[PDB]
Amino acid sequence: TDTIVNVQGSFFSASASGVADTESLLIDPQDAKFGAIEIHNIAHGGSVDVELLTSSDDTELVEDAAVTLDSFTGEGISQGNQIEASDNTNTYIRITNTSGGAIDIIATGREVSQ
């Protein structure tokens, strides 16, 4: 029969260096080519809160629904997530510093079709 090689779907990442004490990385699925994302990894650099938000606006974040998903302490990686967001459902992931000092946040995952 027909043989096909499956290569895995588009890589996605968001990052910020030196995120100040109460500030955040906003992971926006508008930055994806397919307009939806699934974050697998959060490499957190220090303590963070992860938060999932729905916007009232199609293009900007004006908070409607907001749920604090989890809190991470110290430096490390949250591996094996499936936190999902899309542009058309106006969903955003916010990773907020809670360390008391500046940190580096890297989030990686995959683009998903809308």
Q: Which residues bind another protein (CB under 8 A)?
A: 42, 50, 69-70, 72-74, 76-81, 83
Tell me the per-residue interface mask from 1 to 40 with a copy of itself, x by CB under 8 A, - otherwise. xxxxxxxxxxx-x-xxx----------------x-x-x-x
Q: Which two tokens stand for residue 79?
A: 């591996």
Q: Which long-range contacts (CB under 8 A, 24 or more apart) does 70-76 make?
A: 71/47, 71/98, 72/42, 72/44, 72/47, 72/48, 73/47, 74/46, 74/47, 75/44, 75/45, 75/46, 76/43, 76/44
CB of 63 to a copy of itself, least distance (A): 9
* Contact residues: a copy of itself, CB under 8 A: 1-11, 13, 15-17, 34, 36, 38, 40-41, 43-45, 52, 54, 64-70, 75-77, 79-86, 89, 91, 104-106, 108-114
